[PDB]
Amino acid sequence: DDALLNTLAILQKELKSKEQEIRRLKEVIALKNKNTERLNDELISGTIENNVLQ
Amino acid sequence: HDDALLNTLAILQKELKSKEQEIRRLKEVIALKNKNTERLNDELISGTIENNVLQQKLS
- Residues near A5 by Cβ (< 8 Å), separated by ≥ 6? B5
- Stated in angstroms to one decimal place, the resolution of this structure is 2.5
Looking at beta carbons, which residues of chain A come within 8 Å of B40?
A: 36, 39-40, 43
Name B33's Cβ contacts closer than 8 Å, sequence gap at least 6: A29, A32, A33, A36
Contact A36 B40 (CB under 8 A): yes
Cα distance between residue B12 and residue B14, in whole Å: 5
Instruction: Show the 3-state SS of B3-59.
Output: HHHHHHHHHHHHHHHHHHHHHHHHHHHHHHHHHHHHHHHHHHHHHHHHHHHHHHHHC
The total number of structural domains in chain B stands at 1
Give B30's Cβ-side CA count (13 Å radius).
16
Distance (Å, whole) CA B33 – CA A25: 13
Residue positions counted in chain A: 54
Question: CATH number of the domain that A39 lies in?
Answer: 1.20.5.170
CA of B31 vs chain A CAs: smallest distance (Å): 10
Of A54, A32, A22, the C-alpha closest to B33 is A32
Q: Is A35 helix (H, G, I), strand (E, B) or coil?
A: helix
| Residue A51: DSSP 8-state | H
* Domain containing residue B30: 1-59
Q: CA triplet B7, A22, B36: central angle to 5 degrees?
A: 135
Interface test with B, best of A17, A18, A24 (most B CBs within 10 A): A18
Distance CA(B21)–CA(A18), nearest Å, equals 10
Residues whose CB falls within 8 Å of the CB of residue A51, separated by 6 or more in sequence, listed in order? none
Look at B30 and A33 and tell me if their CB atoms are within 8 Å: no
CA-to-CA separations, A27 to A8, A17, A41, B21, in angstroms, rounded: 29, 15, 22, 18
- Say whether A11 sits in a helix, a strand or coil: helix
One-letter amino acid at A43 equals L
The type of residue at B46 is: S
Whether A50 and B50 have beta carbons less than 8 Å apart is answered as: yes
| Resolved by | X-ray
